[PDB]
Amino acid sequence: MHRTYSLRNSRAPTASQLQNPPPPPSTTKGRFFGKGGLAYSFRRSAAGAFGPELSRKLSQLVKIEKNVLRSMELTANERRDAAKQLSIWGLENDDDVSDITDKLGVLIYEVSELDDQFIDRYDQYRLTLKSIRDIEGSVQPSRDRKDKITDKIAYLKYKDPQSPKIEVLEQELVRAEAESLVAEAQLSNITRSKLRAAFNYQFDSIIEHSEKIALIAGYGKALLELLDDSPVTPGETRPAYDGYEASKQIIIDAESALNEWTLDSAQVKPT
Amino acid sequence: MHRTYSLRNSRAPTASQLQNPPPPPSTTKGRFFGKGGLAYSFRRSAAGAFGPELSRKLSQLVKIEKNVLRSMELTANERRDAAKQLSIWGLENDDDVSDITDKLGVLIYEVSELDDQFIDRYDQYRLTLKSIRDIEGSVQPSRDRKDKITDKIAYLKYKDPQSPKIEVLEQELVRAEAESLVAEAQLSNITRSKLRAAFNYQFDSIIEHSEKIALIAGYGKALLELLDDSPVTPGETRPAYDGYEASKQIIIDAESALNEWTLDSAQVKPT
Amino acid sequence: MHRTYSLRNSRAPTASQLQNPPPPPSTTKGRFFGKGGLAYSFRRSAAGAFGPELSRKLSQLVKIEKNVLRSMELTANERRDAAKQLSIWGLENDDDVSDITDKLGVLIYEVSELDDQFIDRYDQYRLTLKSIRDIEGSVQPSRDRKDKITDKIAYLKYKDPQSPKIEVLEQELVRAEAESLVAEAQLSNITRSKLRAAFNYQFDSIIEHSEKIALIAGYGKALLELLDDSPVTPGETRPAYDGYEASKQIIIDAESALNEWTLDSAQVKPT
Numbered sequence: 001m002h003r004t005y006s007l008r009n010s011r012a013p014t015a016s017q018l019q020n021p022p023p024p025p026s027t028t029k030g031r032f033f034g035k036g037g038l039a040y041s042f043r044r045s046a047a048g049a050f051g052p053e054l055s056r057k058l059s060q061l062v063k064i065e066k067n068v069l070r071s072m073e074l075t076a077n078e079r080r081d082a083a084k085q086l087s088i089w090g091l092e093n094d095d096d097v098s099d100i101t102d103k104l105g106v107l108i109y110e111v112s113e114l115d116d117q118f119i120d121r122y123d124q125y126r127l128t129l130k131s132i133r134d135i136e137g138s139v140q141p142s143r144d145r146k147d148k149i150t151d152k153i154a155y156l157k158y159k160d161p162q163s164p165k166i167e168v169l170e171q172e173l174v175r176a177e178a179e180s181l182v183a184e185a186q187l188s189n190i191t192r193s194k195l196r197a198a199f200n201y202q203f204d205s206i207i208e209h210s211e212k213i214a215l216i217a218g219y220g221k222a223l224l225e226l227l228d229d230s231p232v233t234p235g236e237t238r239p240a241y242d243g244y245e246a247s248k249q250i251i252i253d254a255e256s257a258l259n260e261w262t263l264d265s266a267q268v269k270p271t
Numbered sequence: 272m273h274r275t276y277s278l279r280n281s282r283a284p285t286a287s288q289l290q291n292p293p294p295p296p297s298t299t300k301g302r303f304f305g306k307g308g309l310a311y312s313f314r315r316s317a318a319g320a321f322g323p324e325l326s327r328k329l330s331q332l333v334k335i336e337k338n339v340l341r342s343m344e345l346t347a348n349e350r351r352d353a354a355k356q357l358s359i360w361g362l363e364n365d366d367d368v369s370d371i372t373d374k375l376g377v378l379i380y381e382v383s384e385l386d387d388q389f390i391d392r393y394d395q396y397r398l399t400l401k402s403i404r405d406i407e408g409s410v411q412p413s414r415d416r417k418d419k420i421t422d423k424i425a426y427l428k429y430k431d432p433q434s435p436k437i438e439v440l441e442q443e444l445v446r447a448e449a450e451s452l453v454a455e456a457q458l459s460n461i462t463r464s465k466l467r468a469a470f471n472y473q474f475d476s477i478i479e480h481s482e483k484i485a486l487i488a489g490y491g492k493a494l495l496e497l498l499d500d501s502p503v504t505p506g507e508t509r510p511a512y513d514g515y516e517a518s519k520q521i522i523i524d525a526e527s528a529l530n531e532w533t534l535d536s537a538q539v540k541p542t
Numbered sequence: 543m544h545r546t547y548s549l550r551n552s553r554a555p556t557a558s559q560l561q562n563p564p565p566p567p568s569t570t571k572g573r574f575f576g577k578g579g580l581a582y583s584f585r586r587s588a589a590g591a592f593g594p595e596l597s598r599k600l601s602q603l604v605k606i607e608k609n610v611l612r613s614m615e616l617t618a619n620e621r622r623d624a625a626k627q628l629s630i631w632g633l634e635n636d637d638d639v640s641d642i643t644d645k646l647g648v649l650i651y652e653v654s655e656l657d658d659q660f661i662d663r664y665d666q667y668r669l670t671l672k673s674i675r676d677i678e679g680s681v682q683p684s685r686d687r688k689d690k691i692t693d694k695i696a697y698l699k700y701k702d703p704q705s706p707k708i709e710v711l712e713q714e715l716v717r718a719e720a721e722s723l724v725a726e727a728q729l730s731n732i733t734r735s736k737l738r739a740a741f742n743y744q745f746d747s748i749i750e751h752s753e754k755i756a757l758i759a760g761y762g763k764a765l766l767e768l769l770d771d772s773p774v775t776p777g778e779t780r781p782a783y784d785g786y787e788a789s790k791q792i793i794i795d796a797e798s799a800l801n802e803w804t805l806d807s808a809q810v811k812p813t
Contacts, residue, residue, distance in 0.1 A: 001377060001380060001381055001384070001526070002381075002384070002526070002529065002530065011384075012530070014529065014530045014531075014532065015530060015531055015532060015533040015536075016479060016532060016533055016534065019533055019534065020534075022388065022391065023391045023392055023394070023395040024391070025391060026340060026344070026390050026391050026393075026394035027394055027398075028337055028340040028341050028344065028390075028394055029344060034344065034345070034348055036341075036342075036345040036348075036349075037308070040345075054363075057356060057359060057360040057363075058360060060356055061353060061356045061357060061360060064349060064352050064353045064356055065349075065353050066299055067349050068346055068349040068350055068353060069297060069299040070299050070307075071307075071342050071345045071346040071349055072346055073297070073299065073300060073305065074305070074307040074311075074342045075339055075342040075343055075346060077305055077307075078307075078311075078335060078336075078338050078339040078342055079339055081315075081335050082332060082335045082336050082339055083549065084549050085328060085331050085332040085335055086332055087548065087549035087550060088328055088549075088550065089328040089329055089332060091550075092325070092328075093459070093462055093463065094459055094463060096463070097459075097462065097463045097466060100466070100467070101466070102547065102548050102549070102550075103547065104470060105549050106272065106547055106548075106549070109272065109549065110272055110273075113272065113273075117293065119297050119299075120293065120294050120295070120296055120297050121294055122297070123294070123296075123297030123298055123299055124294035124295075126299075127298070181505050182505050185503060185504070185505040188364075188365065188503065189502040189503065191364065191368070192364070192365070192367075192368055192498065192499070192500070193500050193502070195368065195371075195372075195498070196371075196495055196498045196500060197500075199375065199491075199495065200492065200495055203488045203491050203492045203495070204291075204488075204492075206484060206485075206487075206488040207484075207485050207488035207489060207492070208287060210481040210482070210484040210485040210488060211481070211485060211539070213477060213478075213480075213481040214477075214478050214481035214482055214485065214537075214539040215539060215541055216477070217474045217475075217477040217478035217481060218478060218539055218540075218541035219541050220470070220474045221471065221474045221475070221478070222541060224467050224470060224471050224474070227463060227466065227467035228463070228467075229463075229464045229467060229468075231460040231464070232456055232459070232460060233456070234452060234453045234456045234457075248547075251547055253541075253542055254541070255272070255273070257541065257542055258273070258285065259273065259283070259285045259286065260285075260286060261285065261286060261287060262285075262286035262287055262290060263287060263290060263291075265286070266485075267538045267539060267540065268482070268485040268486060268488075268489055268538060268539075269489070269538070270486060270489030270490045270492075270493055270524075270525070270528065271524055271528055
């Protein structure tokens, strides 16, 4: 995190912040709750109350990420609707504005499609986490039985050491202890192997999505040169638009670069 | 778009799709509507019914992108909650799992903060679009007056050419035509100059966010090597964790790279 | 298709569209359904509900193309009626108009006859498709039996592995598997050989019909020069018509060209 040695909510600015000052906080952060939905905030609480004790926090994480997934599909549909609206609105303006808006809407629709693919990959990762949630929830009854049986052993040996079930309960306890030891070993292996794999898949999806949107942004930034900021005096008017071929070539190149992109084609090199 | 010469919904696979087959569609795409909220789908319709005719589609786009912004802040809060839940859940597991989960939660919280910054930039871009929406909505009464006055001229010249207001209405029409010509010129300039600038700012925010999340993904992928997939037999147990310094160095390097990142530091080079 | 990189229903204009702007949409596209008939839209649904599962979409295609054929015979009868009506109406006008209308009606009747011949060829192609529909519908019971028998094998081997019918059912399954393999091979060969042949015959009929109507259109366009656009002042009147021989020669040449036309005589050379 970009925090600092301070007792205030202010954070340490970065190079981008120094070059570009941050905008004021969004006007869409209205004071209702930031909730999004009542079911959104109640599903998590319902999942975190019932079920096995061991599989409680993990179930909460699964439900929270399911809400993440729902909100992401909502924002993907919203963004594709915004692209459609921009494409529709581009008609009323000049030819150059119309073409630029159409290409920008195409790029935003492509971004929405990539978001949907990332949504599918995120659901795959969520199911991978659900598997470990289920196995830990199934493991929990073993240790619950172990503690119940050891409590019974302590109670019987305290109330009457010369009980008829003097050693049968102890032998059952030791075999349950062996079963619980095997269960704990397999739980550790599976949890730690599907955490490092589900999160690896999630990070692969993250980097692929980020690279694709970065390519989209770069190609749109290069396309935006066809639009002109030259202002016209009220009497005058521009000559006819002639940059159709340039826009066509740039969108063809964008599509080709997106198709060619692979895991090894990522230019991001962390240090 | 990655479409193909086909009459089916199937799309042309890319290099990543060929290398990695796509997962099945998400189980969170439940059949209610995909709506998200009733207000979400009614605000747009309300904005697209009233107001000036010219500033109707643009108002719909503004409202749709406001819904985009709300859903994005919702998903940012959801993701930060997921990071907090993962950090909390990391306690119950081994020391290495605890440390890895803590660092992953830190990275996800950083991603959420970057999402919030992108949300602020998106709201700035939305306000930039709102400015052109307002100016076109103010321009529309001029042309509405022009058409009303020309309709009155046609009606008067058809019903009785020798009307007392024979030429005063024509002179008022020509001065209104000059005003409308100036208005159309300034509307074209401002719309086409704030579209190429608001979208340029939006694409700058997009590429910055994408590069930052790509760096986060790469650093997390490099951090995930400290986690081990080696399985332990039920009897045995590992030696104590000793990779604290490696994780500390990798998160310090991630923070330094994020702070150092600037607009010119982007390694994405579109063709 | 002549689509474009756009999010609107507008299509990319062609050279003919640039030279000749497209007319407004037809006034005969009235809002009832575009149905044509209740039986037209219910026959397909009835065919697509019953019958073998494999021979379901193909039966729907056969029924839809039967409706195509019925509507084509309807339009051929309608066009021949239009030609008859034009020939009848030509009497009330001048001699040149009468002769031109008579020859145009002859050409339209010839076009209707060619449409009827194409209708017969289309029905032949539809019967060719019906043959493969029937063979796939007969093949489907084999695989249905195979799945039923393998389901029985799984059920018997799960409920009681030491069943009296331990291996007789397996041997019956393997012989059914051999029969189904032969059936699948022959189905693939026949389907893929009668698709490439029925569609080849259909395309031969298409190109022959198109060339014949193109020759008819060219000959009618050359005949329309006998009609004169010269306007007469109210007092004056033209001399008597004398272009009977020219029209006779042009229709004789049209008939000779239509008779001489063969498959190798087509001047259309695709690239």
